[PDB]
Write a protein that holds these residues in place. Structure first.
Motif, PDB file in Angstrom:
ATOM      1  N   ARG A  24       2.395   0.314 -16.909  1.00 53.58           N
ATOM      2  CA  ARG A  24       2.298  -0.399 -15.646  1.00 53.58           C
ATOM      3  C   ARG A  24       0.865  -0.402 -15.130  1.00 53.58           C
ATOM      4  O   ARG A  24       0.049   0.453 -15.483  1.00 53.58           O
ATOM      5  CB  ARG A  24       3.225   0.219 -14.599  1.00 53.58           C
ATOM      6  CG  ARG A  24       2.975   1.682 -14.337  1.00 53.58           C
ATOM      7  CD  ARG A  24       3.842   2.152 -13.195  1.00 53.58           C
ATOM      8  NE  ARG A  24       5.229   1.747 -13.384  1.00 53.58           N
ATOM      9  CZ  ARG A  24       5.930   1.051 -12.495  1.00 53.58           C
ATOM     10  NH1 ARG A  24       5.371   0.682 -11.353  1.00 53.58           N
ATOM     11  NH2 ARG A  24       7.188   0.724 -12.748  1.00 53.58           N
ATOM     12  N   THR A  25       0.568  -1.386 -14.284  1.00 55.45           N
ATOM     13  CA  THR A  25      -0.762  -1.579 -13.719  1.00 55.45           C
ATOM     14  C   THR A  25      -0.712  -1.320 -12.219  1.00 55.45           C
ATOM     15  O   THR A  25       0.097  -1.925 -11.508  1.00 55.45           O
ATOM     16  CB  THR A  25      -1.281  -2.991 -13.993  1.00 55.45           C
ATOM     17  OG1 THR A  25      -0.712  -3.903 -13.047  1.00 55.45           O
ATOM     18  CG2 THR A  25      -0.910  -3.433 -15.394  1.00 55.45           C
ATOM     19  N   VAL A  26      -1.575  -0.431 -11.745  1.00 56.02           N
ATOM     20  CA  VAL A  26      -1.699  -0.121 -10.327  1.00 56.02           C
ATOM     21  C   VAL A  26      -2.876  -0.900  -9.762  1.00 56.02           C
ATOM     22  O   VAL A  26      -3.931  -1.004 -10.400  1.00 56.02           O
ATOM     23  CB  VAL A  26      -1.878   1.392 -10.106  1.00 56.02           C
ATOM     24  CG1 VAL A  26      -1.797   1.730  -8.628  1.00 56.02           C
ATOM     25  CG2 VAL A  26      -0.836   2.161 -10.889  1.00 56.02           C
ATOM     26  N   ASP A  27      -2.699  -1.455  -8.565  1.00 56.18           N
ATOM     27  CA  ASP A  27      -3.753  -2.245  -7.951  1.00 56.18           C
ATOM     28  C   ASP A  27      -4.770  -1.342  -7.258  1.00 56.18           C
ATOM     29  O   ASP A  27      -4.478  -0.205  -6.878  1.00 56.18           O
ATOM     30  CB  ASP A  27      -3.163  -3.252  -6.964  1.00 56.18           C
ATOM     31  CG  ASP A  27      -2.532  -2.588  -5.765  1.00 56.18           C
ATOM     32  OD1 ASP A  27      -1.981  -1.481  -5.927  1.00 56.18           O
ATOM     33  OD2 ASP A  27      -2.577  -3.178  -4.665  1.00 56.18           O
TER      34      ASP A  27
ATOM     35  N   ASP B 227      -4.843  -9.978  -7.598  1.00 58.00           N
ATOM     36  CA  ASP B 227      -6.275 -10.240  -7.681  1.00 58.00           C
ATOM     37  C   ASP B 227      -6.921 -10.472  -6.316  1.00 58.00           C
ATOM     38  O   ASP B 227      -7.589  -9.575  -5.790  1.00 58.00           O
ATOM     39  CB  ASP B 227      -6.532 -11.443  -8.591  1.00 58.00           C
ATOM     40  CG  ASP B 227      -5.498 -12.536  -8.416  1.00 58.00           C
ATOM     41  OD1 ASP B 227      -4.521 -12.311  -7.673  1.00 58.00           O
ATOM     42  OD2 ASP B 227      -5.662 -13.619  -9.017  1.00 58.00           O
ATOM     43  N   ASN B 228      -6.732 -11.652  -5.727  1.00 55.66           N
ATOM     44  CA  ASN B 228      -7.034 -11.863  -4.316  1.00 55.66           C
ATOM     45  C   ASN B 228      -6.126 -12.927  -3.716  1.00 55.66           C
ATOM     46  O   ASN B 228      -6.153 -13.169  -2.505  1.00 55.66           O
ATOM     47  CB  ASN B 228      -8.500 -12.254  -4.124  1.00 55.66           C
ATOM     48  CG  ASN B 228      -9.357 -11.092  -3.668  1.00 55.66           C
ATOM     49  OD1 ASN B 228      -8.843 -10.050  -3.263  1.00 55.66           O
ATOM     50  ND2 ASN B 228     -10.670 -11.269  -3.720  1.00 55.66           N
TER      51      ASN B 228
ATOM     52  N   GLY C  53      -2.446  -2.184   3.076  1.00 56.72           N
ATOM     53  CA  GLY C  53      -2.998  -2.458   4.388  1.00 56.72           C
ATOM     54  C   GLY C  53      -4.249  -3.306   4.372  1.00 56.72           C
ATOM     55  O   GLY C  53      -4.563  -3.944   5.381  1.00 56.72           O
ATOM     56  N   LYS C  54      -4.967  -3.332   3.249  1.00 54.96           N
ATOM     57  CA  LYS C  54      -6.180  -4.124   3.108  1.00 54.96           C
ATOM     58  C   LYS C  54      -5.914  -5.478   2.464  1.00 54.96           C
ATOM     59  O   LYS C  54      -6.847  -6.116   1.965  1.00 54.96           O
ATOM     60  CB  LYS C  54      -7.226  -3.348   2.309  1.00 54.96           C
ATOM     61  CG  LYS C  54      -7.730  -2.099   3.013  1.00 54.96           C
ATOM     62  CD  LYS C  54      -8.729  -1.340   2.157  1.00 54.96           C
ATOM     63  CE  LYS C  54      -8.095  -0.104   1.539  1.00 54.96           C
ATOM     64  NZ  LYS C  54      -8.886   0.416   0.388  1.00 54.96           N
ATOM     65  N   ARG C  55      -4.661  -5.928   2.465  1.00 46.03           N
ATOM     66  CA  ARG C  55      -4.290  -7.247   1.969  1.00 46.03           C
ATOM     67  C   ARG C  55      -3.887  -8.184   3.099  1.00 46.03           C
ATOM     68  O   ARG C  55      -3.338  -9.258   2.839  1.00 46.03           O
ATOM     69  CB  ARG C  55      -3.158  -7.124   0.949  1.00 46.03           C
ATOM     70  CG  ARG C  55      -3.560  -6.378  -0.311  1.00 46.03           C
ATOM     71  CD  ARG C  55      -2.435  -6.340  -1.326  1.00 46.03           C
ATOM     72  NE  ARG C  55      -2.322  -7.589  -2.071  1.00 46.03           N
ATOM     73  CZ  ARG C  55      -2.655  -7.726  -3.350  1.00 46.03           C
ATOM     74  NH1 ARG C  55      -3.123  -6.688  -4.029  1.00 46.03           N
ATOM     75  NH2 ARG C  55      -2.519  -8.898  -3.951  1.00 46.03           N
ATOM     76  N   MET C  56      -4.146  -7.799   4.343  1.00 45.67           N
ATOM     77  CA  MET C  56      -3.874  -8.589   5.530  1.00 45.67           C
ATOM     78  C   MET C  56      -5.192  -8.978   6.190  1.00 45.67           C
ATOM     79  O   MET C  56      -6.279  -8.719   5.663  1.00 45.67           O
ATOM     80  CB  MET C  56      -2.987  -7.802   6.495  1.00 45.67           C
ATOM     81  CG  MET C  56      -1.547  -7.662   6.060  1.00 45.67           C
ATOM     82  SD  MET C  56      -0.432  -7.597   7.470  1.00 45.67           S
ATOM     83  CE  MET C  56      -1.084  -6.171   8.331  1.00 45.67           C
ATOM     84  N   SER C  57      -5.095  -9.607   7.353  1.00 40.87           N
ATOM     85  CA  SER C  57      -6.267  -9.848   8.175  1.00 40.87           C
ATOM     86  C   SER C  57      -6.563  -8.614   9.017  1.00 40.87           C
ATOM     87  O   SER C  57      -5.710  -7.747   9.213  1.00 40.87           O
ATOM     88  CB  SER C  57      -6.057 -11.063   9.078  1.00 40.87           C
ATOM     89  OG  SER C  57      -5.467 -12.132   8.360  1.00 40.87           O
TER      90      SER C  57
END
Length: 1536
Positions: free
Chosen positions: A1248-1251, A1339-1340, A1256-1260
């Motif tokens: 498995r791949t962990v990001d 990714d983003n 919390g840093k995937r929001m505004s």
RNA sequence: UUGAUGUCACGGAACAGGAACUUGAACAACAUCGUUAC
RNA sequence: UAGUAACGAUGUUGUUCAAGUUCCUCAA
């Protein structure tokens, strides 16, 4: 030529002792050697070392004897036996010595010549005075002459006081040593008398020794004739070995509370399953290492040690253990003493010869918990301590009793004293009575530890507590009896009138002795009073008084208590005491809580907070009673007063009260003067048993229970049926009821309290407190005449709801999804400042909102207090340790259907915060995600290269390539020839590696028309063939390639088209053939016996992972079937698993291993190979950052905690079987890198791949929790201004809803005729949500979607019957689903919402979020991913508040507020209100003849009868990776 | 271990001010395993 | 003379408290 007389004194009271100072400051100029002259001294041998014994000098006894002789000589008219007595001389010409003069006004008798010194026969007083020594006085010392280790081993230094009268707080102070009389009760000495002194001076000396009664601040009668320290270190070591070092102060405060009894350790709480893994009482235990003690075991083995079996030893142990733990958790003056005036000559005055004596006995019990401040040193955990005896007995000193008598005597008159501690005695009316009063100490024989009370202070700008305001306090119990004895001697005919009036005040229960009297501390009551007047004027009563030393000792007191008449004497002038009692009766309608967390930590119930409960004494034992604290009620009333009155513009809540005559400073007092109103505790008039309510915090995105956010509380139950009455009282001063300005303020405050505001107790934001009525009595309608309610004209009706406009197009034969997130805006405003919980602002509204809830779909609100509610009768109760099928009931409080306030608060809060586009209230800004990576070479598996970390964990050395070595096979042997030192990868091996195999054919140009459709025959050249041997299926050949440069041996298996080329082979013919190369990436140990080709011997590392890739099942899969019988069992250890069957049986393809365990599981094991890393390329390594190690720790934590894993521990991988947690110096690594920095480390080929970032840093930056600093600052999200947050109280309070009609359950119960119980329905699985389906990649491109609003449908008709929502099969019970009791459609509830200081656009938006349009509906309850819970709310009277008298029901103002709300909604967002359109689309309820079928997909398409392309076909096509967010945002997208 | 012709220290309330309180629907669908073949 | 291609099985509960203030004023 002497005659020694041995005397011995015996104390009956704790005497006082002075401090030792060197022999330099022992003159008349020191102010501590003086004022320390009437006490006992402390002599220490070997000066500069505190070690000695106390003693009393002889000059003090000489002065006392002289004073008693003067007092006794005027009582018999100056004649001892026969001769008259000379007046004596008290004058000295020299005054450089004699450090202290006399200021006493010496008594007079028979004034004549002073008998000058030039005489030959004196007067007996001259011989007693000492005119080589005439009468020598010796020093008094201890009998055995011991030697103690300082003055702190025999006594304790306590601080005395000197309070004022008008501003009754304090002045200077002083302190002294006092020694108890039960430990040192005897002193001995002698007096050396000459021979020819007299025969009448000895009689005078004996009568003067019998007449004296006190020497050193105490009454006397003179006669003549290692575990706890090491336990603390062990507990500290246990807390430090783990990570639980933040529980140390709670552990100290909860261990100190165990000093009451030793039977509290055998009743400590447990887990919710009855286990022994409590979060603070079971720290220390692990998965392994059984020899690890916990704190419960330490406290259990320390309770029975044959040393801590008594109460005192256990109490001292707990006290010092808590003190040590507190001291470990910690590190994570002006005394006006003396100045007596040196007067040259005493003014001798006469007092007469009439002297009487009055003895008042009795006792005084306590009616309120008292307090006597004795805060000593070496104890810093309580910071507000009481005065105790060395044997832990409660006592009241005589100094406090004397000061209270002085205060009451100054109150009986109207003139305070004007003394200044020096000079001639004061001659006022309250100092001539105080000079004949003698009191005694008490002990009370109770011997019990005192309770601890916690107090705070609330900031009146935010509503929370202030910074640095939290302190303890210990108070003595209620009902303790103290012995009392007062003695007065004077010239009157008994007692004076002032003392009789004061004792009549004390006999009515108005003796406020000492303590925090403003918060209702000690108030005593003198009972069983007796009195008797003696007469020391005659001779037949004075000799009987002197014969038995008065009646001071115990024997004389027991003889005297048979002569006292009962009843106090009636006074001649009464004075009507200046305090009035006012009773208070409060009645509630909701639960009540008064938090106490330490008691909840000790209690065996296992809750978080419990209500406050105080103790009271019954003579020797204590009994607990639930009550309401006096400090909380005082603070409530004070805040109710302070928020109405202005006092020159700024309200009383902003003043500093420095030098102002404010209205709070004249009733409640301040730090400069005492208050004029005293409150008290409030009992509950019944026995209310506490109930337990469970709570949770539902996440916003992927709505489910958040981590570590489950809690509960134990309040007292209240309902409109049983209203939980409260009874109490409070005292007010007499000169306040007569004032007309303060009574108006008290009436206004009590009328604002009665009118519903100011709830009493704890969590009033969810419907606690809620005072229904308040009624006082006992004041002649001076205060209870402004407490009448009023109103205005209430007829206008509420407007109707508007019609909706958002509609959807739902057709048949289509399926729909239930999630549908709502994407928000990008403008969250935080540029407005909060109002402030102070005075009621002018342009803001306050009042009540009455609503009406009505359901239209079955509702489930469970009662989680007990399971197995739907349990069969007449059978076994329950097995101790098993997982059964849980079943609940509906919520009830007093056998009445209700809904809590937190449910409705959360629902309305979610709708209001999604309307105004505010900050995400609760969220999980941690827990980074992880995904299983696919199996395809080009996209993912191309960049993962094999590697190995170096000797230190800093670099990774990469390898060239890899080849797979076969294990678990039957054609080799690699286990018994290799040890464990080279199969773990810690030692290099040497294998033979082949890269390309060569197949063989017979004729290419005649194969064209039927074969050659795979274009692999493009590298064939030529080849000769020989024949050396015969086999059954193959044929041997020796083929050269192009010129005979090399030859290779092979085995070729022919077929139909090459069988004609060979009929009989004579070992010597030359056949023609073509050679083609094929890929063959294998590596063997020695060599195979089938391919004697040139194998390239290489060098590298070998590794194993274990037998993985098990396709376990439960239904006899295709590979378990068509087997050859008798499936074997699973081996208990690996390295012995072999191949049983083949998957393909035509060719010799992939082999499997079929087995069977003891249960019905059937395993089939692939993976007959392992990998071999060779050609380690040196001098090329890449650094490991910290991010890669964080990702690897997350990967290991995910691998090791899995409930879906294989039940057998042999078929798992090396990562999960051996439970690794770090990466060692040499191991297996498939790493990913770019330019000297690595990126990802995976253990196996497909893992498995962990990001990299968290969720919390995937929001505004604006949509995160609007909490923190960014009076209160202005940075708050629009939803944390209506509802609260941390460090800011919210101004909206909800309430408990109550059913009013008949229940009308879903399915009828088992008993007809009882329409108050329903039937059980069984639900589906209801598994937790997956946030890794809305965010597919990392990714983003994949941001966080919206707020997951469930849709409305009718899928409860399939659950009511007994089927599944997805399939049509019947559901079966298991230990994973529930059996709840639900209501039906057509039920009505009613609740109330209280608000304050709202604007005119916040009320309009709150009404828009309460009632929606006429086509929408709310959704609350359990299992609302089916059709369960659909309610709509109609709003009734919205009666406002404009003053403290009238309330002005404002029904006819709603259509204005709503418009203003929308105007604000237009001001913030101009024309970008699409989120409101989507939210109105997601709340749409089917009006008619529309049956939308929604459900969740299955895993595959083969496991549902409908054939609807389950989740394994939906990942390609519709919901592939880039249409997921798009299709999950549109409010109604077909499920396909 | 005190000095003698003079000790009202029973000659002085450890008193005065402070809300254990603020925030939180008991809820909830798609994941978990690795390699095989040429 | 080289490394390419994606397949096979169906089963399963989780959180149980978290973030705050824990001593000051009036005096000295």
């Amino acid at each position: 030529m002497t005659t020694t007389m041995k005397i011995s004194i015996e104390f009956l009271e704790p005497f006082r002792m002075t401090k030792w100072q060197e022999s330099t400051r022992r003159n008349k100029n020191n102010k501590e050697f003086v004022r320390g002259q009437a006490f006992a001294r402390w002599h220490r041998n070997k000066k500069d070392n505190t070690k000695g014994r106390p003693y009393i000098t002889g000059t003090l006894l000489r002065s006392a004897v002289i004073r008693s002789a003067e007092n006794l000589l005027t009582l018999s008219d100056g004649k001892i036996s026969e001769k008259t007595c000379c007046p004596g001389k008290f004058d000295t010409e020299d005054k450089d010595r004699l450090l202290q003069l006399r200021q006493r006004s010496t008594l007079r008798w028979t004034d004549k010549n002073p008998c000058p010194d030039n005489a030959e026969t004196y007067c007996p007083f001259c011989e007693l005075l000492g005119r080589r020594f005439r009468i020598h006085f010796g020093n008094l010392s201890l009998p055995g002459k011991p030697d103690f280790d300082g003055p702190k081993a025999i006594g304790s230094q306590r601080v005395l006081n000197r309070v004022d009268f008008k501003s009754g707080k304090a002045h200077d102070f002083f302190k002294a040593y006092e020694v108890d009389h039960t430990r040192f009760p005897r002193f001995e000495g002698e007096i050396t008398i000459d021979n020819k002194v007299s025969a009448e001076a000895r009689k005078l000396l004996c009568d003067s020794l019998k007449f004296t009664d006190r020497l050193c601040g105490a009454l006397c009668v003179i006669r003549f004739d290692n575990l706890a320290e090491k336990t603390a270190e062990q507990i500290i070591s246990i807390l430090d070995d783990n990570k639980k070092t933040e529980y140390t102060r709670l552990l100290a405060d909860a261990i100190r509370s165990l000093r009451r009894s030793s039977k509290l350790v055998a009743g400590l709480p447990k887990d919710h399953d009855g286990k022994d893994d409590h979060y603070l009482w079971d720290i220390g235990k692990k998965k392994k290492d059984e020899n690890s003690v916990t704190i419960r075991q330490i406290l259990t083995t320390s309770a029975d040690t044959k040393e801590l079996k008594n109460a005192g030893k256990w109490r001292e142990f707990c006290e010092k253990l808590g003190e040590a733990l507190y001291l470990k958790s910690k590190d994570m003056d002006a005394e006006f003493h003396g100045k007596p005036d040196r007067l040259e000559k005493s003014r001798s005055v006469s007092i007469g010869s009439v002297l009487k004596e009055t003895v008042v006995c009795g006792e005084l019990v306590a009616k309120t918990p008292f307090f006597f401040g004795a805060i000593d040193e070496d104890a810093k955990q309580t910071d507000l301590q009481v005065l105790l005896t060395p044997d832990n007995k409660y006592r009241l000193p005589r100094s406090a009793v004397r000061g209270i008598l002085r205060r009451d005597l100054q109150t009986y008159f109207d003139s305070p004293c004007n003394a200044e501690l020096g000079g001639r005695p004061c001659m006022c009316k309250t100092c001539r009575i105080m000079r004949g009063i003698t009191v005694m100490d008490a002990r009370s024989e109770y011997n019990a530890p005192p309770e601890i009370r916690h107090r705070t202070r609330i900031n009146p700008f935010t509503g929370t507590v202030a910074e640095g305001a939290l302190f303890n306090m210990e108070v003595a119990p209620e009902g303790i009896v103290f012995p009392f004895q007062l003695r007065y001697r004077g010239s009157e005919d008994g007692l004076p009138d002032a003392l009789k009036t004061v004792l009549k005040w004390w006999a009515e229960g108005q003796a406020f002795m000492s303590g925090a009297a403003s918060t209702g501390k000690g108030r005593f009551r003198m009972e069983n009073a007796k009195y008797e007047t003696l007469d020391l004027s005659d001779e037949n009563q004075r000799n009987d008084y002197l014969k038995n030393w008065g009646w001071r000792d115990e024997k004389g007191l027991e003889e005297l208590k048979k002569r006292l008449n009962s009843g106090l004497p009636e006074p001649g002038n009464y004075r009507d005491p200046k305090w009035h009692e006012i009773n208070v009766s409060i009645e509630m309608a909701s639960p009540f809580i008064n938090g106490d967390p330490i008691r909840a930590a000790v209690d065996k119930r296992g809750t978080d907070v419990v209500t406050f409960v105080k103790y009271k004494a019954e003579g020797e034992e204590a009994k607990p009673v639930c009550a309401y604290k006096a400090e909380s009620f005082r603070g409530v009333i004070r805040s109710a007063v302070a928020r109405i009155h202005m006092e020159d513009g700024v309200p009383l809540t902003e003043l500093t009260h420095s030098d102002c005559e404010c209205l709070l400073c004249q009733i409640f007092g301040s730090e400069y003067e005492a208050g004029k109103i005293r409150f008290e505790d409030l009992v509950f008039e019944s026995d209310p048993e506490p109930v337990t309510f469970d709570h949770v915090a539902i996440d916003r995105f992927t709505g489910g229970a958040a981590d570590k956010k489950k809690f509960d509380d134990s309040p007292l139950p209240g309902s409109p049926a049983r209203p939980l009455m409260l009874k109490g009282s409070f005292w007010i001063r007499r000169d306040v009821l007569e004032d007309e300005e303060y009574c108006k303020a008290l009436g206004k405050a009590l009328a604002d309290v009665n009118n519903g505001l100011y709830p009493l107790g704890g969590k009033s934001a969810i419907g606690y407190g809620q005072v229904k009525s308040l009624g006082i009595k006992g004041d002649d309608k001076r205060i209870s005449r402004l407490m009448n309610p009023a109103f205005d004209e209430t007829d206008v009706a509420v407007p109707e709801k508007p019609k909706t406009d958002a509609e959807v197009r739902i057709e048949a034969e289509k399926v729909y999804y239930p999630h549908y997130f709502v994407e928000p805006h990008k403008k969250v405003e935080r540029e407005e400042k909060p109002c402030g919980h102070q005075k009621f602002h002018e342009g803001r509204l306050t009042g009540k909102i009455r609503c009406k809830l009505i359901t239209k779909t079955p509702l489930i609100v469970p009662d989680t207090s007990n399971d197995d509610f739907f349990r069969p009768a007449d059978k076994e109760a329950r097995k101790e340790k098993d997982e059964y099928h849980k079943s609940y009931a509906f919520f009830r409080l007093h056998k009445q259907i209700m809904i809590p306030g937190s449910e409705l608060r959360g629902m309305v809060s979610s709708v209001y915060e999604t309307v105004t586009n505010s900050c995400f209230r609760i969220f999980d800004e941690t827990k980074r995600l992880s995904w299983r990576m696919d199996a395809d070479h080009q996209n993912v598996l191309q960049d993962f290269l094999p590697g190995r970390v170096t000797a230190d964990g800093k670099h990774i050395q990469k390898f060239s390539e890899t080849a797979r070595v076969p294990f678990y096979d039957k054609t080799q042997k690699h286990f018994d020839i290799l040890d464990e030192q080279e199969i773990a990868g810690e030692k290099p091996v040497r294998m033979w590696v082949k890269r390309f195999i060569k197949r063989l054919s017979l004729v290419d140009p005649a194969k064209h028309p039927q074969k050659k459709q795979d274009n692999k025959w493009k590298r064939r050249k030529e080849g000769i063939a020989t024949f050396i041997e015969q086999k059954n299926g193959s044929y041997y050949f020796n083929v050269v390639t192009n010129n005979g440069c090399t030859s290779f041996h092979l085995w070729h298996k022919p077929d139909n088209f090459d069988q004609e080329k060979l009929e009989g082979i004579q070992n010597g013919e030359k056949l023609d053939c073509w050679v083609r190369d094929s890929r063959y990436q294998k590596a063997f140990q020695e060599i195979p016996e089938n391919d004697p080709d040139g194998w390239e011997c290489k060098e590298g590392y070998l590794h194993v992972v274990g037998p993985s890739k098990v396709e376990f099942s439960d239904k006899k899969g295709d590979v378990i079937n068509n087997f050859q019988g008798t499936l074997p069992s699973v081996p208990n250890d690996w390295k012995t698993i072999r191949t049983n069957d083949f998957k393909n049986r035509k060719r010799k393809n992939e082999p499997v291993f079929c087995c069977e365990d003891d249960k019905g599981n059937y395993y089939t094991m692939a993976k007959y190979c392992e990998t071999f890393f060779f050609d380690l390329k040196e001098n090329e390594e890449y650094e490991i950052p910290e991010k890669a190690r964080i990702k690897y720790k997350e990967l290991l934590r995910v691998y090791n905690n899995n409930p879906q894993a294989v039940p057998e521990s042999v078929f798992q991988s090396r990562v999960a079987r051996e439970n690794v947690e770090k990466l060692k110096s040499g191991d297996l690594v498939y790493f990913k890198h770019n330019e000297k920095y690595v990126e990802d480390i995976v253990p196996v080929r497909i893992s498995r791949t962990v990001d990299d970032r968290m969720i919390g840093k995937r929001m505004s930056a604006d949509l995160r929790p609007c909490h923190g600093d960014w009076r209160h600052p202005k940075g708050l999200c629009p939803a944390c201004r209506l509802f609260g947050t941390g460090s800011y109280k919210g101004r909206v309070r909800f309430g408990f809803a109550s059913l009013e009609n008949d229940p009308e359950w879903l399915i009828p119960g088992k008993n007809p005729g009882d329409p108050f119980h329903g039937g059980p329905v069984m639900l589906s699985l209801l598994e937790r949500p997956r946030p890794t389906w809305s965010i597919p990649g990392s990714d983003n491109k994949f941001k966080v979607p919206g707020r997951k609003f469930y849709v409305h449908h009718h899928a409860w008709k399939t659950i009511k019957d007994g089927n599944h929502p997805t399939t049509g099969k019947a559901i079966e019970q298991s230990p994973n689903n529930r059996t709840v009791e639900a209501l039906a459609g057509g039920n009505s509830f009613s609740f109330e919402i209280a608000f304050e200081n709202l604007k005119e656009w916040e009320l309009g938006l709150l009404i828009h979020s309460l009632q929606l349009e006429k086509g929408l509906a709310h959704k609350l309850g359990m299992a609302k991913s089916m059709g369960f819970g659909s309610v709509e709310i109609d709003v009734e009277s919205v009666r406002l508040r404009k003053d403290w008298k009238q309330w002005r029901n404002g029904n006819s103002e709603i259509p204005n507020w709503l418009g203003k709300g929308f105007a604000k909604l237009k001001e913030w967002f101009r024309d970008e209100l699409d989120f409101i359109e989507n939210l109105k689309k997601l709340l749409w309820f089917p009006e008619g003849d529309q049956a939308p079928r929604v459900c969740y997909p299955m895993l595959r398409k083969k496991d549902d009868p409908n054939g609807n392309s389950g989740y394994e076909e939906l990942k390609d096509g519709e919901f592939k990776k880039e249409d997921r967010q798009k299709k999950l945002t549109t409010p109604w997208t077909p499920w396909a």
